[PDB]
Symmetry: D2
Subunit: 283 residues, 4 copies
């Protein structure tokens, strides 16, 4: 599987969206799993889930690696509402366009916020819910905020540079030997190719600050079986939010990976893939 061979576009119409272009990468043909990426400059579906798409397809799923609005090859947008909800509407739009009745959702940081909002707004359209360090769930009981990683994320948005990108990636990853030239250059290319997404993200954040993403009060509404994952060493979203989700969602479990930042799906790909595939098959 390659980015090019799996690349697709679909125009969506849902709520505020009118013929809005969504890019995604699709492989496989079984039960649908939509994987949703984080919010840093240059993020996208393929790069976030590169180590996961193959094994999930091998397991029998149809994997859709979705670019959220205002990221990668999806249309540019300035959002005046919290991103989780707007992104969730885009997932619904994509599902309607493709005739997908129910999807399992996997979401990391901003994508975990998206997945939470989707489960709240469209409970009849979600199967299982996999939450990898979801962002925007209010204050931490231990971590000063904004967290170290989020400061760097905003610095890169405002002053994009190759060196600051490298600094951000060093904070994202526990094992900094995963930062090869290929992956650094690749993310840099995503930033260079669409400078307007960076501007727009900052304008959006002014209109709808991170506090607006906090759906904590509604977590008791979630009926989907939920699998929460965290990196022990996550410097972007605080580990105690894994406990917040565990206490407030009805049917949840929490798995914490040691020696791991924001991307367990990268740093611990084999264990991540096995755990999540087992959850989807058997929970």
């Amino acid at each position: 599987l390659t980015e090019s061979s799996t690349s697709k576009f679909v125009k969506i119409n849902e709520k505020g969206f009118s013929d809005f272009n969504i890019h995604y990468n699709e492989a496989g043909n079984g039960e649908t799993v939509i994987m949703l990426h984080g919010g840093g400059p240059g993020a996208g579906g393929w790069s976030n889930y590169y180590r996961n798409v193959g094994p999930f397809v091998d397991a029998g799923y149809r994997v859709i690696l979705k670019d959220s609005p205002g990221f990668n090859k999806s249309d540019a947008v300035v959002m005046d509402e919290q991103r989780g909800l707007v992104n969730a509407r885009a997932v619904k739009g994509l599902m309607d366009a493709l005739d997908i009745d129910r999807a399992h959702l996997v979401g990391n940081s901003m994508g975990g916020a998206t997945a939470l909002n989707f489960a709240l707004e469209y409970p009849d359209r979600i199967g299982k819910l996999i939450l990898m360090g979801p962002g925007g769930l209010g204050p931490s009981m231990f971590a000063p905020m904004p967290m170290e990683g989020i400061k760097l994320l905003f610095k890169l948005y405002a002053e994009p540079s190759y060196e600051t990108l490298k600094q951000m990636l060093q904070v994202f990853l526990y094992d900094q030997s995963l930062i090869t030239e290929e992956l650094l250059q690749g993310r840099w290319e995503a930033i260079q190719r669409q400078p307007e997404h960076l501007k727009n993200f900052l304008i959006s954040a002014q209109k709808a600050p991170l506090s607006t993403w906090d759906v904590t009060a509604r977590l008791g509404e979630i009926k989907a079986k939920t699998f929460i994952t965290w990196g022990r060493d996550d410097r972007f979203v605080p580990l105690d939010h894994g406990l917040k989700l565990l206490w407030n969602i009805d049917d949840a479990r929490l798995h914490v990976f040691s020696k791991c930042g924001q991307w367990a799906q990268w740093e611990h790909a084999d264990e991540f893939n096995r755990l999540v595939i087992d959850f989807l098959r058997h929970a």
Copy 2:
């Protein structure tokens, strides 16, 4: 499989132990997994792991459900050293007697302390390490101590009664509908059959208080791949000790079950069995 059909005895000789009788229940014939029980009155290997022995044997393991010294059908003993270490010596004694070179260990509360001490003392004799709410790892950062469940455990030791047993089991289990007459009567029988174990446990606790069990300072020595499980609703051993283990053991991961007390292996048997079997096969 039944308790009777799997029941075995072996005399051990290791350090202080001289022809000391150990009871265990054994089934299967593949790689050995020794499962180690908790410290409440009437605890034993069979009752603690009744929902687990079958699936593990089906998966290809040889399962040994060990009665620790001073519990169930093993010999009575008064211990003047911390129980984790003494119990670990007994595991070594059993392994030597049975010609088992290496075992995977699964240990709950007192059995998790045992398994930790075994990994520290005999690193060349352990495979993988599965720790289910291990006891005696020092103070909690949040939970007043002694914890609610441990108070009840000591009350039952001192004043054994059917009603206090029921009270203890109600605190052990999140879902109190698991407390059938069969299981209540069965544990009561274990207490009634060996009153001297209760006396002896209390004398032992005076000679070696719970603070003596704390091996926190040595956790960095553990080389075994480690899988830590906790119940979210454990009223016996504090949830933040799961984090303590995760931070201090080199290769660990933490899984927390919602709606679960001290016995995930009972309340969430199917998920527990799948996770642990997958860990043993693939981690």
Copy 3:
């Protein structure tokens, strides 16, 4: 100062309350501090704040030890709304009746919930806010719920007895040598004198469960300078809620007493009195 010499009654009219009798104990004549008690059977203003009223009066305050509705010598009531709000309305009613423009509030457990609701509903009528382990602020990130102490509180409500009262007091207090015959008999007398309050509390709890008390979402509205106290060893309200308040209230500080249960004002009276008096004078 004695209970008898300070005892007063006032009829209140506020919202649902119509000529509702409120008992309180008053001493001193300077700036008003209203102290609000907990929710266990037999609770009341005098017994909760016996070690505090003298020093606060000596410092120049007028102290009002208020009996909340459905406790001690105040009128019996069945509440169908969360107790914090109903109690806060009663404080307002008392203040209006006595021509008190602004009061400092001190509140313990249920009284801390009361004080929070008062600050939210009547911001122009509160001075400073002192919160001693406020109850009902949602789930803990660490403590299974209902907490050990709250189970005992409900047991005593349902099956009042001298022995269960003693058990509850043993859990309330870190230092169990504070439980003299005088204080045990005194609380027992409060329970015996008004059995209907016990019945009514249980009916109220059915109509408005503890989750209904959770005002977490509104904490950002509080403008009052806030001093949060906790006992390290509190088995009734979880220590991490002290952190929740600290993160969510604008101008707060947190003081945690070691070797202390729910009643710092009893177990650490001198330090408590000095700290709170200094806060009222100088913060």
Copy 4:
């Protein structure tokens, strides 16, 4: 009071120290309080405690603002042992030279480690112990390490620059409006005046990593009355270590300031001064 008018030097001889020059600033003449500074480049006694020395002297104490070895105007040194212990020996040396029988200690970060080691090694020479976010107490249960601030501290040590100093100070302080030209230029001057301290600190850290500072196992030995302070928003030393100290020291209390980094004594000087003075007078 000024730095110049209070400046003194004393040669010490204790253990490894032979005619080792210690700089300190002294004012007042009552009971002695020795205040011990943090470990960042350019740290020293005067700058760390500038807002505190006056009020403490006004309260009747003799204040000694000590420069630890390898900082500010004290002699340069490469340490091969953990800094807390070496620094504590220097405090003892200073006390012996000046005929001070007992001192109260106030210590921030590295100075809190110093104060802990002093209380452990020389219990008959300490009065009360005030610990402001002490450093080196092992892993956090929540914070990835090295913490954000400590990374910056090491960056400035290795690559000193005015801009990196400003970045470090922005992370130290919750309220960044406290960073005036005066204070920025002043700290820069301390760095410029003694470049060898920076080199030496880095060599020392190689010989004795932060894990070597962890005295957690010995905290139960401390008999001194202890007052632990933390900033809620401390990005250098993790807030859960305040709880670790509270659980493991016999007679401790914990005060957490909101909207506060590593330096409560700066950001909340008036409240800090009142609390600590009250503790010294009355606890």
